[PDB]
């Protein structure tokens, strides 16, 4: 009933916190520490960052910031495409680690699969990256391990080969790229589904029917999307470098949407992605 609240329970029993704050594109230094030490004082216990984003540090001086103890804080980090592989896995680890400046991270995830020029040249590294992140997980240094942006067809190939099924696959998830497919696979296999740009980007926020929808519950669009991520019992990460926005859009456990509105929003898809198709990516 509250942005601190909000729970999924993922395979292996850890709860993650339903609603966390994204940082891809917030600057390291000042701007990434004070948007996650905001959104930690607005009530958030999820960040979601990466090694690719270069602010893992300032991830870290926000929290530290905060006051609030890091055991009640639920971190996400990601191993980056150029580094998979099995030894290159447990060093970027350990180097995301340092940044962070903590003993453990909450979940790791492989962040891309690979194109498929890339994989046919390449091999699929992920799977071995996959084996890195089950020694990691056998040896208490992650709690929960997953991937990001897994089509089923890698997801098949990950669970031919493992020991531990992977516990979240975050991917594009939006009202018009909804990845209905997907989630009724993951469902299937216990993998719970988190949303990467579930704002579109920012790009969703000026439709029609979305901010129709808010104007009924004097909400914006924003609070409709992300109400509607809370309904379909997905994660979802947000991400603005400004605290009045970080604060709206946690304010959502305090309406519903109907069935109509529900409705109206699933009506919206037309599998359009703002980011890469990880089949086609050429990284
Ligand atoms: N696994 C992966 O490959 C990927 C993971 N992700 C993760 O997902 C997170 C969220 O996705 P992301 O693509 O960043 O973007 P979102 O879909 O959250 O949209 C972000 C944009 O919306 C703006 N915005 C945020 N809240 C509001 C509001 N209430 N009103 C108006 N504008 C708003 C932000 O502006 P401003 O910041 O200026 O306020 C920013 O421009 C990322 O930060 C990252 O953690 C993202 C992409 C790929």
Same mark, same amino acid.
């Given at each position: ?47 979601? *960052? ?5 602010? #893992? ?5 926000? &929290?530290? /910031?905060?006051?609030?103890? =890091?055991?009640?804080?639920?971190? *996400? ?5 150029? #580094? ?5 896995? &447990?060093? /970027?680890?350990?180097?995301? =680690? ?51 942006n897994?089509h ?19 991917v594009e998830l939006h009202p018009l790229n909804n990845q209905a497919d997907l989630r ?9 589904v988190?949303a990467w740009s579930p704002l579109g980007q920012?790009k969703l ?20 999307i992300?109400?509607?991520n809370?309904?379909?019992?997905l ?30 929003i699933d009506?919206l898809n037309t599998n359009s992605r703002y980011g890469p198709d990880p ?5």
């Amino acid at each position: 009933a509250g942005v601190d609240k909000a729970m999924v329970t993922l395979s292996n029993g850890v709860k993650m916190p339903q609603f966390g704050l994204g940082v891809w594109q917030s600057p390291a230094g000042e701007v990434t520490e004070n948007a996650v030490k905001w959104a930690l004082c607005a009530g958030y216990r999820h960040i979601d *960052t990466a090694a690719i984003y270069k602010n #893992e540090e300032s991830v870290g001086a926000g &929290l530290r /910031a905060s006051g609030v103890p =890091r055991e009640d804080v639920f971190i *996400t980090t990601k191993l980056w495409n150029t #580094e998979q592989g099995y030894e290159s896995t &447990l060093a /970027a680890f350990e180097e995301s =680690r340092q940044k962070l400046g903590v003993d453990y991270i909450d979940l790791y995830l492989i962040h891309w699969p690979r194109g498929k020029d890339i994989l046919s040249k390449e091999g699929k590294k992920y799977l071995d990256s996959w084996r890195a992140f089950e020694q990691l997980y056998k040896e208490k240094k992650v709690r929960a391990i997953g991937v990001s942006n897994f089509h089923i067809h890698h997801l098949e190939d990950v669970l031919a080969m493992c020991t531990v099924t992977p516990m979240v696959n975050q991917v594009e998830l939006h009202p018009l790229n909804n990845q209905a497919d997907l989630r009724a696979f993951c469902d299937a296999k216990q993998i719970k589904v988190e949303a990467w740009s579930p704002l579109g980007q920012g790009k969703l926020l000026s439709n029609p029917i979305l901010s129709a929808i808010g104007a009924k519950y004097n909400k914006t669009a924003a609070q409709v999307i992300l109400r509607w991520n809370i309904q379909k019992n997905l994660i979802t990460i947000p991400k603005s470098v400004h605290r009045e926005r970080i604060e709206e859009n946690a304010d959502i456990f305090d309406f519903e949407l109907g069935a109509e509105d529900v409705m109206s929003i699933d009506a919206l898809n037309t599998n359009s992605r703002y980011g890469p198709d990880p089949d086609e990516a050429q990284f």
